Amino acid sequence: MQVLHVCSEMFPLLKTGGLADVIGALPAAQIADGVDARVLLPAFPDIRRGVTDAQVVSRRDTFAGHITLLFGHYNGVGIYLIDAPHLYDRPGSPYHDTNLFAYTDNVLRFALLGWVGAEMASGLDPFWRPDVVHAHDWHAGLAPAYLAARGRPAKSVFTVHNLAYQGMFYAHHMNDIQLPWSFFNIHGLEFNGQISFLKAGLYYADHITAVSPTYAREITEPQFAYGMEGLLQQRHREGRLSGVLNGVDEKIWSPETDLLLASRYTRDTLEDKAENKRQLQIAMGLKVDDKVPLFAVVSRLTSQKGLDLVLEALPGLLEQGGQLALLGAGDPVLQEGFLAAAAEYPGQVGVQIGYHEAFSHRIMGGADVILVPSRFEPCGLTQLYGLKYGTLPLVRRTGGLADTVSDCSLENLADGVASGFVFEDSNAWSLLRAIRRAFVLWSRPSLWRFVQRQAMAMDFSWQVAAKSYRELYYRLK
């Protein structure tokens, strides 16, 4: 069984969010579980420099110009790179320029990603050919389309990590991407009078996967599908939609071995976490105080994440005696709002705007609560990281958060199953109730400790996830 993942990022080489974490860990899990998994990525500078043993497999001409297909290894997994410097050798973000504008040739940059994914099924590499092309998110959405147009020389799975990113391009670009014009149809890749790469992935794949069981159910609803629900309802009825929960990479997210921490610790030695908290407070400019709960955010700052609710809830949180440490980058309204909060409440609110990989570990390892009040959340990896680090997740019951966190209710505490704090509605009052719940449990230190140890007993394993994908791949044949 040979599988090629087609995607635009991979931890630790290039990361803008959880997708990178997935691609960095799943393939090695699949190999352990008996599937020859390989990865296809554009040769962005950071990726190209990480894969030091990469060799030439072939040169091709393409609707988007020439590629050199490279193959090397990273952390033992086979990595193909699309070297096309005219498309991919640009600084910063893979998706947009310095001014945060999408590249004007994005249609070509990502149509090419899908195209190479599909070519691989036809022998682009004379030495290896995937049985299944596994495409991730809109960026790779054309791969099942090129496969369909070639008579499906391999099976395809499409996994949605986030349905809110649709890969919308003007219809005239059908001219530029070498797909049958007949594909521009509602029974095809057309969506609201434009090309959608997301629609393409959803429509042409043999099977669609979402990144949690409940997100898979949610995307059949208008509220979470944004127009795509009709397609998704049909694919569900056909038995072509399913949810496979993400795992966590233990090599990197384990307080037991985390080299980025002031102090390592375990489920049975949580007293060793205290030093991380002290150093976090010092680093953030917070009052150094072990009697007070430290709430935390590590997050992209977009409306998905419900962090406007945190801004609203903040006075209530501070009034009860809590602290907030935030790390994040995104909407300037959010950035400025949180910066204003830190200025207004020095020693109670610490804020760091930007992307800081190492600093997220020090927050995860020092904080008491991780706020994930998402409006929607396909999976959420930060709350899984919180569980593992005994930093109790406070979450909205939506998507993967609904699948992974158990509220501190009477039954859950009595059944020994409670692991965090759950609220229902996307408003600050509903959030503030879960926050109050946290303060109440905080006032009972041995119950807090009991919930911490249950959080740390939760297991999110890539090799277990691998087993589900494997069933899928064999089912498709």
Ligand X SMILES: Nc1ncnc2c1ncn2[C@@H]1O[C@H](COP(=O)(O)OP(=O)(O)O)[C@@H](O)[C@H]1O
Ligand Y SMILES: O=S(=O)(O)C[C@H](O)CN1CCN(CCO)CC1
Ligand Z SMILES: OC[C@H]1O[C@H](O)[C@H](O)[C@@H](O)[C@@H]1O
Q: Does 162 bind ligand Y (CB under 6 A)?
A: yes
Q: Does 100 bind ligand Y (CB under 6 A)?
A: no
Q: Does 22 bind ligand Z (CB under 6 A)?
A: yes
Q: Does 140 bind ligand Y (CB under 6 A)?
A: no
Q: Does 226 bind ligand Y (CB under 6 A)?
A: no
Torsion sign across C-alpha atoms 432, 415, 418, 448: positive
93: Cα within 13 Å, side-chain hemisphere: 13
Q: Does 161 bind ligand Z (CB under 6 A)?
A: yes
Q: Does 378 bind ligand Y (CB under 6 A)?
A: no
With respect to ligand X, which residue has the nearer C-beta, 260 or 292? 260
Provide the phi-psi class of 3: left if phi over 0, else alpha when psi is between -120 and 50, else beta: beta
Q: Does 463 bind ligand Y (CB under 6 A)?
A: no
With respect to ligand Z, which residue has the nearer C-beta, 348 or 398? 398
Through-space distance between the first and last CA atoms of the chain, rounded to whole angstroms = 9
What Å distances lie between residue 428 and 273, 310, 346, 423, CA to CA?
30, 7, 22, 10
Q: Does 17 bind ligand Y (CB under 6 A)?
A: yes
Q: Does 167 bind ligand X (CB under 6 A)?
A: no
Q: Does 280 bind ligand X (CB under 6 A)?
A: no
With respect to ligand Y, which residue has the nearer C-beta, 168 or 283? 168
By CB under 6 A, which span of 158-166, 249-257, 326-334, 342-350 interacts with ligand Y? 158-166
Site for ligand X in 380-439 (CB under 6 A): 380-382
Size of the site for ligand Z (CB under 6 A): 14
Q: Pick from 10, 18, 362, 438 the residue near ligand Z by CB under 6 A.
A: 18
Maximum distance among all Cα pairs of the chain, rounded to whole angstroms: 66
Q: Residue 211: name its binding partner from ligand Y, ligand Z, ligand X, none (Cβ under 5 to 8 Å by kind).
A: ligand Z
Size of the site for ligand Y (CB under 6 A): 10
Q: Pick from 51, 142, 262, 379 the residue near ligand Z by CB under 6 A.
A: 379
Q: Does 152 bind ligand X (CB under 6 A)?
A: no
Q: Does 380 bind ligand Z (CB under 6 A)?
A: yes
Q: Does 393 bind ligand Z (CB under 6 A)?
A: no
With respect to ligand Y, which residue has the nearer C-beta, 19 or 280? 19
Smallest gap, in angstroms, from Cβ of residue 1 to ligand Z? Answer: 22
With respect to ligand Z, which residue has the nearer C-beta, 357 or 415? 357
Q: How many whole angstroms from its chain centre is CA 298?
A: 13
Q: Residue 360: name its binding partner from ligand Y, ligand X, ligand Z, none (Cβ under 5 to 8 Å by kind).
A: ligand X
Q: Does 373 bind ligand Z (CB under 6 A)?
A: no
Site for ligand Z in 228-287 (CB under 6 A): 246
Q: Does 393 bind ligand Y (CB under 6 A)?
A: no
Q: Does 194 bind ligand Y (CB under 6 A)?
A: no
Q: Pick from 168, 260, 318, 329 the residue near ligand X by CB under 6 A.
A: 329
Measured distance CA(429)–CA(24) in Å, rounded: 38
Q: Is 15 annotated as a binding residue?
A: yes
With respect to ligand X, which residue has the nearer C-beta, 276 or 382? 382
Q: Residue 452: name its binding partner from ligand Z, ligand Y, ligand X, none (Cβ under 5 to 8 Å by kind).
A: none
Size of the site for ligand X (CB under 6 A): 17
Q: Does 165 bind ligand Y (CB under 6 A)?
A: yes
With respect to ligand Y, which residue has the nearer C-beta, 198 or 231? 198
Q: What is the 3-state secondary structure (H, E, C) of the chain?
A: CEEEEECCCECCCECCCHHHHHHHHHHHHHHHCCCEEEEEEECCHHHHHHCCCCEEEEEECCCCCCEEEEEEEECCEEEEEEECHHHHCCCCCCCECCCCCECCCHHHHHHHHHHHHHHHCCCCCCCCCCCEEEEECHHHCCHHHHHHHCCCCCEEEEEECCCCCCCEECHHHHHCCCCCHHHCCCCCCEECCEEEHHHHHHHHCCEEEECCHHHHHHCCCHHHHCCCHHHHHHHHHCCCEEECCCCCCCCCCCCCCCCCCCCCCCCCCHHHHHHHHHHHHHHHCCCCCCCCCEEEEEEEECHHHCHHHHHHHHHHHHHCCCEEEEEEEECHHHHHHHHHHHHHCCCCEEEEECCCHHHHHHHHHHCCEEEECCCCCCCCCHHHHHHHCCCEEEEECCHHHHHHCCECCHHHHHCCCCCEEEECCCCHHHHHHHHHHHHHHHCCHHHHHHHHHHHHHCCCCHHHHHHHHHHHHHHHC
Interface with ligand X by CB under 6 A: which residues?
17-18, 21, 298-300, 327-329, 355-357, 360, 379-382
Interface with ligand Z by CB under 6 A: which residues?
17-19, 22, 161-162, 211, 246, 377-381, 400
Q: Which residues define the annotated binding site for ADP-alpha-D-glucose?
A: 15
Interface with ligand Y by CB under 6 A: which residues?
16-19, 95, 102, 137, 161-162, 165
